[PDB]
Amino acid sequence: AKAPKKVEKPKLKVEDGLFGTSGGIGFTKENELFVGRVAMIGFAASLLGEGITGKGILSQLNLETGIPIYEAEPLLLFFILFTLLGAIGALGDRGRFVDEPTFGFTKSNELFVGRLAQLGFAFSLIGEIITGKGALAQLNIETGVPINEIEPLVLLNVVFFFIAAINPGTGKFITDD
Amino acid sequence: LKVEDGLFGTSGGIGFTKENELFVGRVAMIGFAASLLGEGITGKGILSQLNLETGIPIYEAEPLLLFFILFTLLGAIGALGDRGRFVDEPFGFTKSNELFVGRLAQLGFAFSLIGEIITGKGALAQLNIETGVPINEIEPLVLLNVVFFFIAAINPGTGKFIT
Numbered sequence: 264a265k266a267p268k269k270v271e272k273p274k275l276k277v278e279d280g281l282f283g284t285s286g287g288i289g290f291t292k293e294n295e296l297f298v299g300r301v302a303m304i305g306f307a308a309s310l311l312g313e314g315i316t317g318k319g320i321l322s323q324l325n326l327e328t329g330i331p332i333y334e335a336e337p338l339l340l341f342f343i344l345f346t347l348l349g350a351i352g353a354l355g356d357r358g359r360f361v362d363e364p365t366f367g368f369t370k371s372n373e374l375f376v377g378r379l380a381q382l383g384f385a386f387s388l389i390g391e392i393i394t395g396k397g398a399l400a401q402l403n404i405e406t407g408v409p410i411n412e413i414e415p416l417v418l419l420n421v422v423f424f425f426i427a428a429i430n431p432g433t434g435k436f437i438t439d440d
Numbered sequence: 441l442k443v444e445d446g447l448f449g450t451s452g453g454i455g456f457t458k459e460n461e462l463f464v465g466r467v468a469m470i471g472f473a474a475s476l477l478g479e480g481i482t483g484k485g486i487l488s489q490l491n492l493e494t495g496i497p498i499y500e501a502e503p504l505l506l507f508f509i510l511f512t513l514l515g516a517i518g519a520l521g522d523r524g525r526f527v528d529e530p531f532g533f534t535k536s537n538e539l540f541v542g543r544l545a546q547l548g549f550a551f552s553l554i555g556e557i558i559t560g561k562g563a564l565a566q567l568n569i570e571t572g573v574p575i576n577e578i579e580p581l582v583l584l585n586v587v588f589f590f591i592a593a594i595n596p597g598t599g600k601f602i603t
């Protein structure tokens with residue numbers, strides 16, 4: 264009927280919030296996962312779009328390329344900063360992913376695919392800003408691999424990222440408390 | 441029960457702990473700062489100071505350097521393991537703030553290295569070209585940044601580590 268009084272356990276303030284703080288402020292791992300999916304689809308669409316048109320994504324979006332970074336649209340620079348900070352989990356990494364207590368990707372695997380996507384996307388965008396060359400052209404130049412031999416390998420990436428972006432992942436999200 | 445915070449998110453208990461990461465991060469802070477300072481003193485990027493070939497495509501660069509860049513990048517995003525937690529003790533910088541300064545240093549270092557490989561220009565010169573700000577107006581701010589990383593690399597940070 265009446266519950267016994269519980270000796271209140273010393274609650275732990277976890278340092279996994281915005282820039283590491285413990286004040287419960289910042290993205291959860293779920294938020295990060297979503298943002299990561301958006302980056303997966305964006306990166307994939309960038310590569311596919313360039314593979315089809317021959318033009319980088321920023322060029323297709325009517326933005327100036329082949330310019331120093333300080334001349335680029337500040338909104339683009341902000342998106343790049345956001346993407347990078349998110350990739351390293353600086354915008355908050357609150358909570359945990361755990362195995363479903365009881366054979367594809369787990370939610371954490373998904374999270375890391377998302378972070379890799381964020382890195383590659385940010386790097387490719389900065390690259391296009393400075394050089395005027397899209398992610399595919401950059402890949403061709405830096406790998407030494409001819410375009411015809413790099414196209415299928417890139418198409419495999421587009422498919423990989425697209426599938427990953429829709430895959431929920433196994434396991435469950437758990438709040439710090 | 442089984443946390444997914446190990447190597448590439450695995451729960452097997454394989455991978456770096458947050459402490460390992462923090463250490464690697466300190467090493468990164470010191471490396472980055474020392475490379476900036478070194479460019480200031482020598483006028484040459486760190487890779488040129490180490491006499492490594494620059495102004496070249498990535499695939500022609502030394503495999504150990506590329507190894508190091510990948511390692512640094514994967515470490516920055518926690519893919520090499522992020523096991524355990526940092527919690528408040530039951531300036532003001534916690535070990536988590538420290539971890540993120542380290543990750544920032546890792547991103548910046550990796551960036552500058554790839555940039556130097558491709559362009560043959562050190563981090564300071566990259567900064568100059570990409571901000572429009574003259575080198576002489578740049579160096580004080582960078583020196584301040586250099587002092588910060590050295591301070592952070594040595595600062596233990598408050599809080600503790602839980603398994």
Ligand code: CLA
Nearest residue numbers: 402405406407497498499500501503504506507509510511
């Ligand atoms: C030593 C380990 C090593 C590691 C861990 C990395 C890690 C990374 N590299 Mg670098 N790289 C290396 C050595 C390494 N590289 C060497 C030796 C070269 C010269 C060819 C390059 C040239 C290179 C380029 C141009 C790029 C990367 C990229 C990458 C990323 C992943 C892509 C990848 O793994 O393909 C690496 C390729 C292999 C590991 C080759 C497969 C190995 C099989 C086992 C052996 C094949 C040898 C040969 C073909 C067999 C016949 C021998 C002879 C007849 C030729 C990551 C940053 C890319 C990136 O920036 O992110 C995506 C990128 O664009 N790498």
Ligand SMILES: CCCCCCCCCO[C@@H]1O[C@H](CO)[C@@H](O)[C@H](O)[C@H]1O
Nearest residue numbers: 292293294295296297298301302342345
């Ligand atoms: C760079 C592209 C996106 C810019 C801003 C990202 C805002 C992050 C919020 O994420 C939220 O996290 C939840 C997790 O489940 C989702 O359910 C929810 O729908 C989603 O809104």
Ligand SMILES: CCCCCCCCCO[C@@H]1O[C@H](CO)[C@@H](O)[C@H](O)[C@H]1O
Nearest residue numbers: 297300301302304305428429430431432
């Ligand atoms: C609880 C687990 C749910 C996992 C799967 C959720 C779907 C995530 C897909 O992201 C989508 O990315 C696009 C970016 O271009 C947007 O158009 C679109 O609005 C956005 O929804």
Ligand SMILES: CCCCCCCCCO[C@@H]1O[C@H](CO)[C@@H](O)[C@H](O)[C@H]1O
Nearest residue numbers: 458459460461462463464465467468508
């Ligand atoms: C240029 C190479 C990259 C950096 C070296 C990687 C070593 C990773 C192991 O971390 C360990 O974590 C502890 C945390 O407390 C430290 O005390 C300890 O000394 C350290 O060994």
Ligand SMILES: CCCCCCCCCO[C@@H]1O[C@H](CO)[C@@H](O)[C@H](O)[C@H]1O
Nearest residue numbers: 487488489490491492493501502503504
């Ligand atoms: C300081 C941290 C890392 C340890 C090793 C530093 C690398 C510098 C050594 O130069 C070596 O000699 C020649 C000149 O660069 C090159 O032909 C060769 O590629 C390179 O191997």
Ligand SMILES: [Hg+2]
Nearest residue numbers: 490491492493
């Ligand atoms: Hg030499």
